[PDB]
Design a protein around this ligand. Sequence first.
Ligand SMILES: [Ca+2]
Ligand SMILES: [Ca+2]
Ligand SMILES: [Cl-]
Ligand SMILES: [Mg+2]
Lengths: 65, 244
Amino acid sequence: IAEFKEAFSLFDKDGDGTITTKELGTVMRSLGQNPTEAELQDMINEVDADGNGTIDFPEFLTMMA
Amino acid sequence: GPMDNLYLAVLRASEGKKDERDRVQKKTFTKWVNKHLIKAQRHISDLYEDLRDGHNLISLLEVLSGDSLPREKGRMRFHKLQNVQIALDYLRHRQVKLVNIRNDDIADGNPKLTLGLIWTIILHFQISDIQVSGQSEDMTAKEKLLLWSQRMVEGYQGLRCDNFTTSWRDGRLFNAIIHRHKPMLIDMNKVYRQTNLENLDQAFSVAERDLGVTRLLDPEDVDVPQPDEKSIITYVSSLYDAMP
Ligand SMILES: [Ca+2]
Ligand SMILES: [Ca+2]
Ligand SMILES: [Cl-]
Ligand SMILES: [Mg+2]
């Protein structure tokens, strides 16, 4: 869906179709939060279904469903 | 176990973006509605409160159409729901699509569906009117308005009209369109040398003062990475309306 793609693009700064810990931290800091590196990695790991260390759109969709 | 923390960060960012969109559309649509309601001696202060009982919506439709609509005089929630439905039925008869917009949602002041209702009204009464020399066959109204905008700014150095969002943020397009219409109104040398906010403020001011076009947009909401498309289209359409 288009709504989820807009939400994904908020995080996917370089538009390579994946969200990294740095991209996640960037958004969270822009919203007044200050997560640690370990915290960021935990957040990604939880929904990183294929274990490759980043979140792609299909993994994103699964999370948001 | 799982703690949903990425989900919550996405929710925060996404809700932030959607709330900002709602905020900007609310301003645009309130000003647009009031441009018409004044002709019926009515005025909206809060778009999410002042349409709930159906009376201002019915009046808005009467002004836009020149028609007489029925109107419930009862004061209970039952009558407000009926009253709102009168407006919806008027639109539905005219084949206006109102997906998921119910009399309950308007009576409850739902932001998304109240904004959505005004947008469909703007689309039907104002934006859908446009015809443009050079238009293709099954072009949408939006596509025709984009073509019109593109034609108006041909010949202006370094200006591009690719969309109804980012192309408009720096205010140059708004100024060029006014200048094309009445060049004495706009100093394009100033336009090229000015900041985005200066250009936006000036275009909106000249269009209101000299072309009778209501200022629907605040420069600070347009000079952003992603201007609101519905808001831009509404205002650009209004520029078109003032240029016979
Ligand atoms: Ca990326
Ligand atoms: Ca992955
Ligand atoms: Cl319904
Ligand atoms: Mg109902």
